[PDB]
Design a protein around this ligand. Structure first.
Ligand SMILES: CCCCCCCCCCCCCCCCCC(=O)OC[C@H](COP(=O)([O-])OCC[N+](C)(C)C)OC(=O)CCCCCCCCCCCCCCCCC
Ligand code: SF4
Ligand code: SF4
Ligand code: SF4
Lengths: 155, 318, 70, 298, 176, 55, 96
């Protein structure tokens, strides 16, 4: 029936979306150099099918990586805004997760989710490179469990 | 049956371009000791499909300050011209046996700059504007050497008929006669096609994404498809020009083997260069062309015009 | 190692393989086995138009010689 | 004409909260301050703090500090060169060296237990011992890294595109460089005859020989040669420290500033009190002030 | 001591300038780069196959926290309250209470993963090795709430990774 | 290591140096991850003879 | 395990098809690795539990679980203490 056909069509879109995302690491702090470390030949995101792409109008997932301050706050949001859909943000490190080591200082917003809708929270200070690689794997598993076409069918 | 042959030419190239993203991604990674796409299907074979249909399902956001008619015409010209680049190629027997194919080749290649200028203006952002202006500025500087190189190279061929290049190279590769021009032609092809060090047009690190700084999703692939299609065609054009192959009339299969095998070798050395050299700079980009390339091209052209006369080796015009 | 990229480029060789084979075989098939008789100059063109009119079937590629004259 | 480096897009409390954290609690800040040179920061903090306490670490502790300090120097100079090559174009030396960067990052993990923010260099020495055989693995790494440096120089040093984007670019005279408050390689590239490890040798740096790579032009290229030479001279320190690693304790033999050994914690009462007040109140540093200076790779 | 890095003496003999002209005309040094990267390609890669194989780690690794218990099974924690006093980010919150037996342990051991920074000071602080922090690093999540670990969450995780961390401190307590 | 002498020759000639002598990866030369228990030394002032903190 | 491969890929895994009543043939996660084997796989100890079984305890989780985020058996934080200020209980029946 139509449910089976739309299920296949959803999976066809699902498979590419979980295998062709191009992250844009908004390099902030010591969390950022770790993401460049999981760009090293040791882990090599690109073997999964993701490429470090600038010009965030091309990227799909964007990674906040480090502390986020009020000075960085409004610009960082705008990066999220003209970031085209589907758009997902992954919280890298404790500082981006919940302020972390600077949670009480006067200049850093406690947690990055206060600015953008965090999809995956990755703990770490810094999260070891493969721990983020795990988080990216979780992103594709979550991407696998969506019902975009299915919901529209019942809409 | 002329029609089915046309789709038999344009469809395989588009699929070839898609797979070019995968091989370049893997080969470039391998220089960097990485592995490149190997998770999405066997050895990443379905990565081009994954990238292609993910971007198609991404909304083509038009910038607020954009002329939509102007924003859309540029990819149409860019992609159509790139696919039109192959219609006079001497692939076994050339599709469009234009007696002036080389001029037709150059005119269409030079018309590609309108996509660069129009994309930058239609985007209407300072970053895109100066990105495009220098992009064409790099672009318009070099094809004068392209024309000079071809005029000197084709001088011993006999005419501008692309099919005639096969009979000229019937014995030895044409590179041996004009290897100073061969490297002259080769480097200028990178500048036209905008690969590193001549990537200041795009400049991923320092110009974000050049004219594609905003260009996203749907029609972004068109520049990407047109760009990578030109890579094969320019390398294919170099393959026939200098690295000619014997062509038995009773077996065009054999020369296709030689032509094809050469043109992947020429594309492979393209991204091989990318994975080794720093990116150039705008001033050196012009200075290298106008100070050390133009004078050498002039002299070599002067050498190659007089060479057939001093050796009584002028070629037949037919 | 580098034997993993050969699957990528082998498909590439197959992609560029197709246009050469098609235009070779369609030219062979349409023009009765022979290749497309090219006419870069008006002489070769009016050569063909003579062949098309002389074939008795209005196709140039149909070649028919000494069996005609008497 | 003019460029304004508008900074502050990362300004955290840092010093502001240090007024509220004890000396031990403040130590991890430096690991996160100049985050790419992990140990070299906390080297400065420990040297500063132990100076006020008038307590010198045991010689075994000093040798571990300098070995990791120069290993950290390898960490940062690889960062500085490869990241620069990223933006200049060629990006393969990036990945080539980053494969090595993991190896010393793995070494960080073997000793401290974390990848980047080791928090190893504590006032009074180091927190823990090197695991058995750790010197052997870094010895294997040390042998092969000289080749990896050759990859960089072969990749970049003679390449025209690299040079022309770098040579005679951003040159600064010695007087302005010194007046600008510059330091480290910034002065050395302009031919300035100065180096903290040599002129004011802190820790063991006096009992080791190395050649400071003084440039002679002051442009960007001179510093690039100076930095890659600093790599090789850093490799000299690893070898000298390797063959001359003395035995002995890891921290000072003063429980008032060094937490007692875990074994002594649970058998000796004085250790319990000393461990207790150290982890809740912390050692009291005598009043005063001190600007302690070390040559970070930056 | 010191050494110069760019004092160069280009010999002006007719021999040497030929190489310099050869270098500029024929891109010899550029070809050096091409053959350099080609040798790299002809080498193996070092990309570990995650998650089918993961990075090499060490027994001293600092990961996710997990409260443990004695061989008898009673919680090692006695609410000495050292760990939060040294906790550089104040991620440890705890309140002790009287217990029915009189072995009055804590009713609250809440460590905020998004505030904690994984220094490992808590382990060194704890006199009974109650709070250790395990080798796991896969404890990612999608909502900020599930990172606010509580007394129950640590106890469950301690009972989960008990097989691992027990050997880790077994092979590392001599160093500590 | 795995790699045959043929393309080992290709790496050696293209790089201008022998790479089999030392490689950027690791092999059996690495000390195994079950090192024996240590016997870390004692402090210089660990003596139970005259050791007064007044010194 | 294969000692001939370089450090890292020298020992590895392919995951099971059934994990705690969950289909995992296509999906792959690193967290189904049980703790005692998690020690050996990360090269934290080069001797597998098959030859050095972990010490048995009454409380050690008999069935290891993967990450439960995004699933109905997720973790949800909640205050573990007890409400301390209790209201004055309103009496009942009379008036004045
Ligand atoms: C009887 C004999 C008749 C003929 C004799 C001809 C003379 C002898 C032969 C001379 C050499 C050949 C002609 C000149 C070639 C060089 C032109 C030139 O300007 O060089 C200097 C130029 C400029 O060097 P420069 O900028 O350092 O110095 C130039 C001089 N000043 C400083 C005054 C400006 O070199 C380059 O442009 C470097 C290469 C740039 C492009 C980057 C990619 C290079 C990829 C190389 C590998 C791939 C090669 C593929 C070859 C083709 C394969 C099909
Ligand atoms: S979470 Fe830790 S490692 Fe990451 S930016 Fe904050 S302090 Fe640095
Ligand atoms: S490692 Fe322990 S002491 Fe340090 S911040 Fe985290 S919970 Fe607190
Ligand atoms: S976990 Fe240890 S340090 Fe923390 S309160 Fe309990 S006994 Fe004290």
């Amino acid at each position: 029936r139509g449910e089976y056909v739309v299920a296949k069509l959803d999976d066809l879109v699902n498979w590419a979306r979980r295998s062709s995302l191009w992250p844009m690491t908004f390099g902030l702090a010591c969390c950022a150099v770790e993401m460049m470390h999981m760009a090293a030949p040791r882990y090599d995101m690109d073997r999964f099918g993701v490429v470090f792409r600038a010009s965030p109008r091309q990227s799909d997932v964007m990674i906040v990586a480090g502390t986020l301050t009020n000075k960085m706050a409004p610009a960082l949001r705008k990066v999220y805004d003209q970031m085209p859909e589907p758009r997902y943000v992954v919280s890298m490190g404790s500082c981006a997760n919940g302020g972390g080591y600077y949670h009480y200082s006067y200049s850093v917003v406690r947690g990055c989710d206060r600015i953008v809708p965090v999809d995956i929270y990755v703990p770490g200070c810094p999260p070891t490179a493969e721990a983020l690689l795990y988080g990216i794997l979780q992103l594709q598993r979550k991407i696998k469990r969506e019902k975009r076409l299915r919901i529209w069918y019942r809409r | 049956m002329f029609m089915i042959n046309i789709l038999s030419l344009i469809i395989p190239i588009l699929l070839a371009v898609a797979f070019l993203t995968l091989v370049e991604r893997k080969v470039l990674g391998y220089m960097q000791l990485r592995k490149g796409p190997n998770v999405v299907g066997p050895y990443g074979l379905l990565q081009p499909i994954a990238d292609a249909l993910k971007l198609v399902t991404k909304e083509p956001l038009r910038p607020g300050t954009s002329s939509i008619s102007m924003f859309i015409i540029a990819p149409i010209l860019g992609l159509s011209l790139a696919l039109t680049m192959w219609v006079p190629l001497p692939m076994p027997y050339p599709l469009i046996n234009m007696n002036l194919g080389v001029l037709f080749m150059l005119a269409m290649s030079s018309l590609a700059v309108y996509s660069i200028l129009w994309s930058g203006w239609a985007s209407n952002s300072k970053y895109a504007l100066i990105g495009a202006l220098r992009a064409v500025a790099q672009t318009i500087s070099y094809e004068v050497t392209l024309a000079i190189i071809l005029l000197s190279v084709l001088l011993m061929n006999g005419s501008y008929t692309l099919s005639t290049l096969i009979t000229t190279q019937e014995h030895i590769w044409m590179i041996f006669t004009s290897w100073p021009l061969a490297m002259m032609w080769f480097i200028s092809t990178l500048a036209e096609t905008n690969r590193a060090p001549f990537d200041l047009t795009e400049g991923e690190s320092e110009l974000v994404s050049g004219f594609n700084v905003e260009y996203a999703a749907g029609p972004f692939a068109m520049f990407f498809m047109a760009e990578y299609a030109n890579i094969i065609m320019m390398n294919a054009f170099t393959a026939i020009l200098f690295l000619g192959a014997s062509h038995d009339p009773h077996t065009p299969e054999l020369y296709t083997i030689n032509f094809v095998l050469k043109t992947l070798a020429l594309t492979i050395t393209f991204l091989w260069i990318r994975a080794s050299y720093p990116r150039f700079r705008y001033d050196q980009l012009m200075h290298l062309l106008w100070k050390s390339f133009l004078p050498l091209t002039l002299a070599l052209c002067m050498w190659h015009i007089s060479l057939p006369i001093m050796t009584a080796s002028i070629p037949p015009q037919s | 190692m580098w034997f993993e990229i050969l699957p990528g480029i082998a498909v590439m060789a197959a992609c560029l393989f197709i246009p050469g084979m098609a235009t070779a075989h369609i030219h062979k098939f349409t023009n009765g086995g022979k290749e497309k008789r090219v006419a870069h100059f008006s002489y070769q063109w009016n050569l063909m138009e003579r062949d098309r009119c002389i074939s008795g079937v209005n196709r140039y590629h149909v070649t028919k010689g000494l069996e005609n004259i008497d | 004409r003019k460029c304004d480096p508008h900074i502050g897009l990362l300004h955290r409390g840092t010093e502001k909260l240090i007024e509220y954290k004890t000396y031990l609690q403040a130590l991890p800040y430096f690991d996160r301050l100049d985050y790419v040179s992990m140990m070299c920061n906390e080297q400065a903090y420990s040297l500063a703090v132990e100076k006020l306490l008038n307590i010198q670490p045991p010689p075994r502790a000093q040798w571990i500090r300098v070995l990791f300090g120069e290993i950290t120097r390898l960490l940062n100079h690889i960062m500085a060169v490869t990241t620069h090559a990223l933006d200049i174009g060629a990006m393969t030396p990036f990945f080539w060296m980053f494969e090595e960067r993991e190896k010393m990052f793995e070494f960080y993990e073997r000793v401290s237990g974390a990848r980047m923010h080791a928090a190893y260099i504590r006032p009074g020495g180091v927190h823990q011992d090197l695991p058995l055989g750790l010197l052997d693995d870094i010895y294997e790494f040390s042998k092969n890294f000289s080749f990896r440096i050759d990859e960089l120089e072969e990749m970049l040093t003679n390449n025209r595109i690299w040079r022309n984007r770098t040579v005679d670019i951003g040159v600064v005279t010695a007087e302005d460089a010194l007046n600008y408050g510059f330091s480290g390689v910034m002065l050395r590239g302009s031919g300035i005859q100065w180096d903290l490890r040599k002129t004011q040798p802190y820790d063991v740096y006096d009992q080791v020989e190395f050649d400071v790579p003084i440039g002679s032009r002051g442009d960007c290229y001179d510093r690039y040669l100076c930095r890659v030479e600093e790599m090789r001279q850093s490799l000299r320190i690893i070898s000298q420290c390797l063959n001359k690693m003395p035995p002995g304790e890891i921290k000072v033999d003063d429980a008032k500033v060094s937490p007692p050994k875990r074994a002594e914690m649970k058998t000796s009462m004085e250790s319990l009190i000393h461990h207790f007040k150290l982890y809740t109140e912390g050692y009291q540093v005598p009043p005063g002030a001190t600007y302690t200076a070390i040559e970070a790779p930056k | 001591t010191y050494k110069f890095v760019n004092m160069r003496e280009p010999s002006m003999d007719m021999k040497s300038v030929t190489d310099r002209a050869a270098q500029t005309l024929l891109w010899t040094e550029l070809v050096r780069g091409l053959g350099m990267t080609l040798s790299y390609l002809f080498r193996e890669p070092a990309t570990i196959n995650y998650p089918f194989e993961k990075g090499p780690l060490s027994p001293r690794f600092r990961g996710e926290h997990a409260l443990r218990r004695y061989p008898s099974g009673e919680e090692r924690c006695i609410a000495c309250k050292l760990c939060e006093a040294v906790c550089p980010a104040q991620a440890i919150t705890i309140e002790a209470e009287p217990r029915a037996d009189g072995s009055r342990r804590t009713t609250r051991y809440d460590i905020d993963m998004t505030k904690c920074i994984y220094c490992g000071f808590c382990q060194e602080a704890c006199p009974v090795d109650a709070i250790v922090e395990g080798p796991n690093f896969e404890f990612s999540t999608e909502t900020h709430e599930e990172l606010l670990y509580n007394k129950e969450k640590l106890l469950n995780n301690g009972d989960k990774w008990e097989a691992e961390i027990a050997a880790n401190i077994q092979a590392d307590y001599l160093y500590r | 290591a795995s790699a045959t002498r043929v393309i080992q020759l290709l790496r050696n000639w293209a790089s201008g140096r022998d790479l089999q002598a030392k490689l950027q990866l690791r092999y059996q030369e690495i000390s195994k991850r079950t090192q024996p228990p240590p016997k870390l030394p004692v402090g210089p002032s660990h003596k139970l003879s005259n050791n007064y903190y007044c010194t | 395990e294969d000692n001939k491969q370089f450090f890292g890929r020298h020992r590895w895994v392919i995951y099971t098809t059934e994990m705690n009543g969950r289909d995992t043939f296509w999906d792959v996660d690193g967290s189904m690795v049980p703790p005692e084997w998690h020690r050996w796989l990360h090269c934290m100890t080069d001797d597998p539990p098959t030859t050095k079984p972990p010490t048995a305890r009454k409380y050690i989780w008999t069935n290891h679980k993967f990450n439960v985020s995004g699933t109905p058996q997720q973790y949800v934080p909640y205050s573990t203490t007890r409400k301390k200020i209790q209201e004055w209980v309103p009496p009942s029946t009379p008036y004045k």
